[model samples]
Target: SKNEWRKSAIANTLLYLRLKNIYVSADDFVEEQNVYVLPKNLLKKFIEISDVKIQVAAFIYGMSAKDHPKVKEIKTVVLVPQLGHVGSVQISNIPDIGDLPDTEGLELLGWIHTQTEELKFMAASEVATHSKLFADKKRDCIDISIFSTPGSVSLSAYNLTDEGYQWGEENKDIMNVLSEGFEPTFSTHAQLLLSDRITGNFIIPSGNVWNYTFMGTAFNQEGDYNFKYGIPLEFYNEMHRPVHFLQFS
Candidate 1:
């Protein structure tokens, strides 16, 4: 029954992608149109603790479908230390659709792990405290800190709200989504740390790895209020509500 519900939701999501004209096929995908490529060099520096090969592969895979043709033009690429890699690449931008592409056509590539052991110690509270550390910097989306320890990795995204402060309390729901769906096994420590960070009980170490991903789209639109973009299956378990996962990766 769950799978059936998911199947229906996925189908509806895919239809929305089509209406938006996000190309899902690999043979005809191009990076410049709607896809974004995370620069390899940036990834190396951001996720310095992870296997460069694995991270790079994951970055590329996240940008496009596996076995899909290489993206011709990569839009702006972004890098974050602990989060590994993520990007948006255009599959097709047709006439009358403006810049829209079929984002749902992209498929999950694979998962990448970080090699650095220190990433495990980073927590969300640190990110909130150190918001000034990145205040003046220009980066894509929000400032996110990613940590991995043992069998689990934690990801947290922070933004400066209209209130003139970077806060995580309101975004706990999204953080929970990131934690719940992580594959290859989840970490109780990571979950606990995230909980502590959101509650303002702990802070992550600055020296610890800071990870970033570009492929992810933040929920700024009203449509996103319904979790239209893909959220991992695990996140649904935690929220008891359905969410969409990015068609790519």
Candidate 2:
């Protein structure tokens, strides 16, 4: 199966995250991590508009399982726009967490975020703030970030490091994470196969209401390279032989 073949891809990712103090095992992800199959068109929409680059977030959901069951298909994608402000721009208000699954068939997986035009990389201060905000909202929550560059899209996924506890752990100064620009170190920097085949109307899932496209582009497949942390995606999708996937951890 593809999952069995992708073991190294997943294992290496875990190692990368462990370096930053964000650790996990195959069981933590296993049949679950392979979500986030971002569509190419949706990504292109984000590129077409909102070059201003505000930070955005989203939650993943799937069918709920009773005991020893498995759910892999991603059901709905929801985005969480920051309610209050950005540098100077401000919105009248609401939590960054958008619509989440209730106690029904839907099971909320994790969260996703992005850095826009001006900020090309996931700034440390950026990770510090968001992760801390939602830390205890759930501990096993997956955290992902996206940013863009000239020729390719960029990304970094994270769960949590021991450093910042959303609701607890009293030592590290939150201000320091901000002042020192302590962004969460992404385990891998993935690359997408932007074949000029990159098409149009890149509006991401939850962006229709706000009317701004939002998503991170990816080249995170085999031969997919990175300019930042240097973690290259080490596996290939046998069916497509593809080199990019906005897949999550």
Candidate 3:
């Protein structure tokens, strides 16, 4: 069924962006790259969300590629889990872009959502949503969809094609576009990095004498900490395996 879905000529327009692997041949290598630097624990949670029946949506926060033209390092994911439903999800509370916290190198990279229905291809509604969010040319926001059904689940990444942009900007009907076979550029797997690991863990309770502890050392207070121009510190776990840990470097 997966191959069947990919047979459509319109579907051929979808660009499946996968992570760079050593095995990727020279001829198959991509030059203008697109990526998502997903942490391992966060990726597990992302997969867990796809297993649900209701739709879910979240905003991806991260630092953009500074010197390089088109790489991205996704650092965090914040779910809008309150008003989710079987058919769709909504962001009830959205702050203005200027209102977001002014953390160093903080950026709104893109949006991610899970599709619980059988609709194949990037849904027409998704195209419209991305057009609105991608209005900020500097952000180069991405649209990630995790489609799931009774026994199958898949993740796809997409960005607007010229036609997709016009269709959304003109307020055209999505149903019409779907009937003609949607033609947005849908990517395969982008690099979902597991390098970023969590630092602390804790439990909470109000009965049987509640007790909890979230312990960790503070970060360097007097040193160069900017990810762009800073000295990186790497740590090795007890087993002598590299942890690949860093606040931002």
Top-lDDT candidate index = 3
- What TM-score does candidate 3 reach? 0.52
* Residues 1-249, model 1: lDDT tens digits: 677546634432222121222111123433433332333332322233232112221211223324445431222121112222222111110111112234324332212223222333223332322233333432121322333333333343233332222343332222323322232111112110111111101111122212222223521212211111121221112233324677876
Q: Candidate 2 residues 1-249, lDDT tens each?
A: 556546633432332221223111112344433333334443333333222233444444445323334423334444332221232111111132223223246455554444544443334454445455455566555544555333344544455554534322342223432334243343223221222232211112232233122111221112211111111111121321324558788
Residue 100: error of model 3 in Å? 7.4
lDDT of 3 by residue, 18-88 (tens): 11211110123355656555554454445443324445565676775565545676665654212344555
How many clashing residue pairs appear in each of the predictions shown? 31, 13, 6
Best by TM-score: 3
Question: How well does candidate 2 score on lDDT at residue 119?
Answer: 42
Which residue runs does candidate 2 get wrong by more than 4 Å? 1-36, 39-49, 63-73, 81-104, 116-122, 166-177, 180-249
Question: Which regions of candidate 3 are displaced past 4 Å?
Answer: 1-27, 47-51, 64-70, 81-87, 92-102, 117-120, 136-139, 149-153, 172-249
Lowest lDDT sum, 10 consecutive residues, model 3, at: 206-215
Task: TM-score each candidate.
Answer: 0.21, 0.42, 0.52
In lDDT terms, how accurate is model 2?
0.35
| Alpha-carbon local distance difference test for all models | 0.26, 0.35, 0.44
